[PDB]
Amino acid sequence: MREIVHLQAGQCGNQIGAKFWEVISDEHGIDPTGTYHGDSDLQLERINVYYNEATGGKYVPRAVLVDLEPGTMDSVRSGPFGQIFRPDNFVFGQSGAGNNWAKGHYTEGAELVDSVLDVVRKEAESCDCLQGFQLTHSLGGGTGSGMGTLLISKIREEYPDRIMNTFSVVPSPKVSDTVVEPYNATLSVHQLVENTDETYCIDNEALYDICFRTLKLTTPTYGDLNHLVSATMSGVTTCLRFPGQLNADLRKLAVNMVPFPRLHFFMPGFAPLTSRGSQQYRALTVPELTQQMFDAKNMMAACDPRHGRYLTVAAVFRGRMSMKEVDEQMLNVQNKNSSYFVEWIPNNVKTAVCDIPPRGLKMSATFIGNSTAIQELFKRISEQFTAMFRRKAFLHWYTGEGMDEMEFTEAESNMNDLVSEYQQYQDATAEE
Amino acid sequence: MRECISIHVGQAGVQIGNACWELYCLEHGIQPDGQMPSDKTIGGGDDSFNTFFSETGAGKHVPRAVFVDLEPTVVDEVRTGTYRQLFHPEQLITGKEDAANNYARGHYTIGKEIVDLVLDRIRKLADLCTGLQGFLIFHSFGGGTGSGFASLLMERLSVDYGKKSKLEFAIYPAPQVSTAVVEPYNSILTTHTTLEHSDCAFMVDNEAIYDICRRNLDIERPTYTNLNRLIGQIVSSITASLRFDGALNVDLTEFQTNLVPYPRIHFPLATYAPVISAEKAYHEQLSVAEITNACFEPANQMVKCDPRHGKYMACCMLYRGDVVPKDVNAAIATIKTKRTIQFVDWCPTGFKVGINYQPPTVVPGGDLAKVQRAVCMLSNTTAIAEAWARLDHKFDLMYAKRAFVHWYVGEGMEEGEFSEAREDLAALEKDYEEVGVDS
Amino acid sequence: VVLTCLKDKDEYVKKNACTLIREIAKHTPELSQLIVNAGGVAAVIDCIGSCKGNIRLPGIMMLGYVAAHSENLAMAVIISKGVPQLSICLSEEPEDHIKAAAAWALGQLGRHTPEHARAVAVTNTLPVLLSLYMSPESSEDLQLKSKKAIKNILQKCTYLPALEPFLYD
Amino acid sequence: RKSLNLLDKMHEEKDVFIQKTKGEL
Amino acid sequence: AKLLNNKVIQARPGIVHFGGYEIESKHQQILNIANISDEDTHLHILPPQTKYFQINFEKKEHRLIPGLSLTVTITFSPDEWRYYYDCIRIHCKGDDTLLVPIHAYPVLNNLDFPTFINLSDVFLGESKSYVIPLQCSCPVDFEFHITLLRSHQAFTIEPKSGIIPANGKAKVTVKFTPIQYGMAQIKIQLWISQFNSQPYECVFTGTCYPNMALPLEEFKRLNTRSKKVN
Amino acid sequence: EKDLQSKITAMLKDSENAMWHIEIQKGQFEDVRKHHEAEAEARQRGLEVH
């Protein structure tokens, strides 16, 4: 029946995927052994979306870990839930990527690609019918970015009628990890805009700022970021995992949420981000959550949505409140904040409430919007790419791999066209 | 997997390898016998020691390194040591004649005699290993062995293995203090080989080591032991994510790929921190921001060069110990806005995050204290080109009247090679000055 | 099916295929025209360049016959670049009869229109032929065929820079 | 593809060699 | 007949050059000779055959002891703008003869050739032209020729090759016609028809980028606030 | 010069072997470019102007 196949790429992708698996296992009541220790009702019927039916009721995960470094599988396996996955899916090579996109795509992307295609085709044939494929990776390296684009292209070529959703990590000039990071981001954007259905923006600096200034944590680490992104993913996927009154699915969003195929980027966000001392002093209501989901402070963007206009908005709720409050809130917001959304298209916010509350928290609601704020990131990426491609720095490595430089030129032309398109649709006037 | 082979040429290379191996054995709890005699009270050792050592069927560890020298006295000095039961005699090749600060003999009439033996040794070592990433060649420019023999071996290793990383670690002759006289003569020829046949090269001197030890450690009578200890700590910090794991592992390839902006400019600036003694590590609050800021201080650099004379191409920063990401982010935000540090208008940012869970350990008998976390940095700047300018000036003023050149002519070598090396160094300096110039 | 036999790993098979095409392309220009239209001259040339020894002799002789047959066949052979391969066989093959056959084929090629001789001349074959015919160690047949080639090529060669060195040698 | 890039690169280097040979001759 | 050195002697500079001379101006150059051989040697120098080159040197001792250097100064007084040439004769013991050339030729002044050129943004359909002035200080003509290591279609250069007039200035016009949004760069080499010519390298770069001017949106929202003030 | 030009003609027969490879190049490597060079150039105008 309707199942979702999950994919893994990049060390950060691997760790966030493991965190998501642990979070969903805890929420649905699964012991680290592999059996079932839940006590709910809807945690048995649609549990097969991410698991598989086996003897003795031992559900197995459905995720393929793709990596170029063997040191990642050892790290993720030693965890409390690393002994539950399929070791066959841990397809690792012998040579690392070295934060190179071209080298990994060519060298470590030819003789290793066949095995992961074989395992994913076996998994797809194992189920009856599927909807889409979820891949969580990062653009910071040659592992997630070099292989994710190739595998997405392969699966789209083989099975065009599937959902291509991903949650890659955007870079940031303030917080970097690779000197040639803008090169790899440049190379990845072309494949993302050419051979990907939808893509969501993930930033680490914004999450760090959010936790520091709102959560007020002592020693924030990558574990907190993985926890937050996993909670975001569960909030996104609860529309299908836990059906309620008004259920939705990934493709209905991706159709209603994307005006043009060349603009498929989104802006994801969670509402209740409070400090440890404020959990016992809070007022659970609609207007508070609307304000936290509308302001730019809770938003995990490393930019300002207020500089442009809102294009499409989706408010996904998870709780038992009402229906009237959401629509009245949206109506009055559109009435007052008239200079923040496209006037040519009214009713840009979608209503969605999940009647099944999450485990451990009664109230949850995730924000999936596509506001006019990413243009700053695109233009700065283009500017830095131009600056570094002017004198052709850090290029002899890619040249020594064998690929020519015309790919950089066609890519930069593509981003210039795309940023021109974004700025031209930014101030969408009614008439002349 | 992540396994590398170390090469030690000359007395300095041999002693540096000895210091590195003893540091590795003490940090991993490896006993000098070669087995695990600790059957009563365990103190560690259950880790991934395959990176440098090898596991036998009887529980023995075999080091994987090359200890070659043209003079037998150093081999005998190590052989009469207490660690003689650890390595194998076949790995310490003796010799009748030695270069002893001479390039011509040790490159033509001496180094060309022992070639097949070392080649067979290294081939067997590679065959015994599964995954090879790079090499750890330890030599010196002043020493004739570690210059002529090192160049002749590296030229063959480059053509025998093109897909393997070729590192370089040696000592650069200080302009103020020096040990011999013909050091620039060997350096001018070794630099050409290391530039046009290798991928990366690290230069350090001893004057800066003396300055930092007297300034922080506050010692009046230094010795080579501390000098070797500092280099061993640096090497351990560099290859830290290999023997162990962490939040963001940084392998050899991961950092060498970005550490080389151009084939001609592959000469980074290392800086270890904190370099402090026992009393200097007790009543001093240590955080990440302070040490990162101190890392850019010229007084803490191992190369005597003012960073403010130029600006930076690329910076590679690593960490080892209980480092918190928020502190790293705060330090990055602090340095990116600092006016004193100079950079270019084409590289707004670039750096690496290597988080190592294993804290650096200590040695009973040394001067280093127990510090909760460490940091090392590898930046690329054009302000270091002055050392090559001074070296070229010295070689020019020595070569005008051809001082101590008749010996090399009698040995057999082309005098035109001096002009070739001079013009190659001039071209390299021109490239460096062109790169340093912005728009 | 025979043209593919010039690509097998075996050598004597290639020699047999060459001998067969040679005996075929020797009687009338119609058979040679059919062979050219079937695209076999290029295959023979490539097999000759990819092999050495007496195996090159049947190919050199067939292409000489084809060139001597008519003008269109010679032009097609020239377009297929047969001349520099004759130079190769003349130079690298130490045997004398192979050199003589190469010289005869070059002469039959250059005995056509001045364009043929110009295409032969620009490949640097005339000085080699002169040296071989001025060589005492050369055999009688080799020298005779070299002189015949020189007479058949210089009678219509119009490339003056190629004819200039002959004024002194 | 870059084995496809060898297609152009090899013959272009051979053209450069043709230039070198013509100049030297 | 040997050049720049001998078994017995070595000469630096190996070749004598008088570049950018001035008519009737008495120019001086220093040539030094060192004794390579370990024996003590006599040196015989035949004076220049021409009346433009006048040789001058001091001899304190005949036998030039090994390692010693003999400094010789050559004086030059040209009468007209042309390439002058002479060879100086040096004789050691035996048949150890030395051939050393002396070239005199005018050289164009030091040009302010840039290595980098960063040109401003030009929107598509526009064009920008930069003029490189080639100043000639000598009353003779010089031939220039351009070569393109890497080239782009958006760049047009006029002229590729030509002549700088006597005491005149040439004008090289590089025109950037924006083909596409983005950045176009060229690596350009200029060859000059002068003796011992080192061609001059340069980089040209043009960019094309539009904008949207955010702050006026802030002014507009302030205007909306003012409208709501009433 | 005469023996080095005999040698230049020998290495020019070797460079003629290089040109013999060059006819494999100018038999197939531009055989593909006869079509794929033209169908890789026209549409830059599409992206550029319209």
Q: How many Å lie between the alpha carbon of F13 and the closest alpha carbon of chain C?
A: 7
Q: Which of E116, E185, E187 to mutate: most B Cβ within 10 Å?
A: E116
B325: nearest CA in chain A? A221
| Chain B residue numbers touching E67 (CB-CB < 8 A) | 401-402
Evaluated on CA atoms B193, B196, B198, B201, the torsion sign reads: positive
Q: Which amino acid is at E184?
A: A
CB distance A395 to A405 below 8 Å: yes
| Chain E residue numbers touching A339 (CB-CB < 8 A) | 220-221, 224
| Chain E residue numbers touching F47 (CB-CB < 8 A) | 180
Chains that contact B by 3+ CB pairs under 8 Å? Answer: A, E
Domain count, chain A: 3
CB distance A147 to A93 below 8 Å: no
| Of residues B439, B383, B134, the one with CA closest to residue B265 | B383
Do A406 and A363 belong to one domain? no
Give domain status of residue A92, yes or no. yes
Asked if the Cβ–Cβ distance from E209 to A417 is below 8 Å, we say: no
Do A233 and A176 belong to one domain? yes
Q: Which of A391, A413, A427 sits opposite E180 (nearest CB)?
A: A413
Do A241 and A171 belong to one domain? yes
Residues 6+ apart with CB under 8 A from B212: B275, B299, B300, B302
| Of residues A267, A367, A246, A362, the one with CA closest to residue A316 | A367
CB distance B174 to B207 below 8 Å: yes
Asked if the Cβ–Cβ distance from D11 to F29 is below 8 Å, we say: yes
E180 touches chain F (CB under 8 A): yes
E180: nearest CA in chain F? F48
Report long-range pairs for E78-81 (Cβ below 8 Å, ≥24 apart). Answer: E78/E21, E78/E22, E78/E23, E78/E24, E78/E25, E78/E52, E78/E104, E79/E23, E79/E24, E79/E52, E80/E23, E81/E23, E81/E106, E81/E138, E81/E139, E81/E140
Asked if the Cβ–Cβ distance from A106 to D5 is below 8 Å, we say: no
> How many Cβ atoms sit within 10 Å of the Cβ of residue B427?
11
Q: Give how far Cα A39 sits from Cα of A54, A359, B297, B318, Å.
A: 20, 11, 61, 47
Chains that contact A by 3+ CB pairs under 8 Å? Answer: B, D, E
Give domain status of residue A40, yes or no. yes
Q: How many Å lie between the alpha carbon of E186 and the closest alpha carbon of chain F?
A: 20
The DSSP code sequence of A15-35 is: HHHHHHHHHHHHHHT--SSSS
Mode of pairing for the β-strands spanning B373-381 and B269-273: antiparallel
Give domain status of residue A194, yes or no. yes
Query: Residue A325 belongs to what domain range?
Result: 265-374
> How many Cβ atoms sit within 10 Å of the Cβ of residue C69?
21
D4 touches chain A (CB under 8 A): no
Report long-range pairs for C27-35 (Cβ below 8 Å, ≥24 apart). Answer: C28/C69, C29/C69, C29/C70, C29/C73, C32/C65, C32/C66, C32/C69, C32/C70, C32/C73, C33/C70, C33/C72, C33/C73, C35/C66
Residues 6+ apart with CB under 8 A from B232: B16, B19, B20, B22, B23
Do A128 and A145 belong to one domain? yes
CB distance A208 to B326 below 8 Å: yes
Do A158 and A47 belong to one domain? yes
Q: How many Å lie between the alpha carbon of D11 and the closest alpha carbon of chain F?
A: 7
| Chain A residue numbers touching B333 (CB-CB < 8 A) | 174
Do A250 and A282 belong to one domain? no
Do A321 and A414 belong to one domain? no
CATH of the domain at A410: 1.10.287.600
Do A284 and A388 belong to one domain? no
Asked if the Cβ–Cβ distance from C127 to F23 is below 8 Å, we say: no
| Chain F residue numbers touching D21 (CB-CB < 8 A) | 12, 15
Residue with tokens 């002891």: E65
Asked if the Cβ–Cβ distance from B401 to E69 is below 8 Å, we say: yes
Q: Give how far Cα A413 sits from Cα of A84, A223, A385, B159, E122, Å.
A: 46, 38, 12, 40, 16
E116 touches chain B (CB under 8 A): yes
The DSSP code sequence of B224-293 is: HHHHHHHHHHHHHHHTHHHHS--SS---HHHHHHHH-SSSS----EEEEE----SGGGTSS---HHHHHH
Give the integer Cα–Cα distance in Å for B270 and D14.
Answer: 43
Do A332 and A288 belong to one domain? yes
> How many Cβ atoms sit within 10 Å of the Cβ of residue B179?
13
Q: Which two tokens stand for residue A207?
A: 């999450």
Give domain status of residue A430, yes or no. no
Annotated binding site of A: 11, 69, 138, 142-144, 204, 226
Domain's final residue, options A207, A222, A257: A257
CB distance A293 to A226 below 8 Å: no
CATH of the domain at A335: 3.30.1330.20
E123 touches chain F (CB under 8 A): no
Do A364 and A280 belong to one domain? yes
Residue-wise burial string across A286-323, b where 16 or more C-beta atoms lie within 10 A, e elsewhere: beebbebbbeeebbbbbbebbbbbbbbbbbbbbbebee
Q: Strand pairing partners for A65?
A: A8
Largest CA distance in chain B: 70
Domain's final residue, options A208, A238, A257: A257
Annotated binding site of B for Mg(2+): 71
Chains that contact C by 3+ CB pairs under 8 Å? Answer: F
CB distance E131 to E171 below 8 Å: yes
B438: nearest CA in chain E? E116
Give domain status of residue A431, yes or no. no
Whether there are 3 or more C-beta pairs closer than 8 Å between E and B is yes
DSSP E199: P
Mode of pairing for the β-strands spanning A63-67 and E161-164: unpaired
CATH of the domain at A80: 3.40.50.1440
CB distance A231 to A23 below 8 Å: yes
A110: nearest CA in chain D? D1
For E88, the 3-state DSSP assignment is strand
Domain's final residue, options A257, A286, A308: A257
Residue-wise burial string across B186-214, b where 16 or more C-beta atoms lie within 10 A, e elsewhere: bbbbbbbbbbeebbbbbbbbbbbbbbbbe
Q: Which two tokens stand for residue A209?
A: 């700022």
Asked if the Cβ–Cβ distance from F15 to D11 is below 8 Å, we say: no
Q: Which of F6, F16, F25 to mutate: most C Cβ within 10 Å?
A: F16
Q: Strand pairing partners for E116?
A: E203
E210: nearest CA in chain A? A420
Asked if the Cβ–Cβ distance from A386 to E214 is below 8 Å, we say: no
Residue with tokens 């007039």: E165
Evaluated on CA atoms A412, A415, A421, A424, the torsion sign reads: negative
Q: Which two tokens stand for residue A418?
A: 């795309």
Q: Strand pairing partners for A175?
A: none
Q: Give how far Cα E88 sits from Cα of B143, C3, E2, E11, E100, Å.
A: 44, 70, 12, 12, 6
Active site (annotated) includes residue B254 = yes
Asked if the Cβ–Cβ distance from F23 to C88 is below 8 Å, we say: no
Q: Strand pairing partners for E131?
A: E173
Q: Phi, psi at residue A27, to the nearest 5°?
A: -70, -40
Q: Which of B257, B263, B329 sits opposite A100 (nearest CB)?
A: B257
Give domain status of residue A307, yes or no. yes
Residues 6+ apart with CB under 8 A from C108: C64, C65, C67, C68, C74, C152
Give the integer Cα–Cα distance in Å for B171 and B35.
Answer: 34
Asked if the Cβ–Cβ distance from D3 to A404 is below 8 Å, we say: no
Give domain status of residue A432, yes or no. no
Do A139 and A247 belong to one domain? yes
| Of residues A175, A106, A205, the one with CA closest to residue A146 | A106
Burial zone of C13 (CB within 10 Å; 0-12 exposed, 13-18 middle, 19+ buried) = middle
C131: nearest CA in chain F? F6
Q: Which residue in B22, B168, B183, B254 is the catalytic one?
A: B254
E71 touches chain B (CB under 8 A): no
| Number of CB pairs, chain A paired with chain B, less than 8 A apart | 87
Rg (alpha carbons) of chain C, rounded to whole number: 15
| Chain A residue numbers touching D5 (CB-CB < 8 A) | 402-404
CB distance B374 to B319 below 8 Å: yes
Is the bond leading into A272 cis (omega within 30 degrees of zero)?
Answer: no
Q: How many Å lie between the alpha carbon of E227 and the closest alpha carbon of chain A?
A: 13
Do A75 and A220 belong to one domain? yes
Give the integer Cα–Cα distance in Å for C6 and C35.
Answer: 14
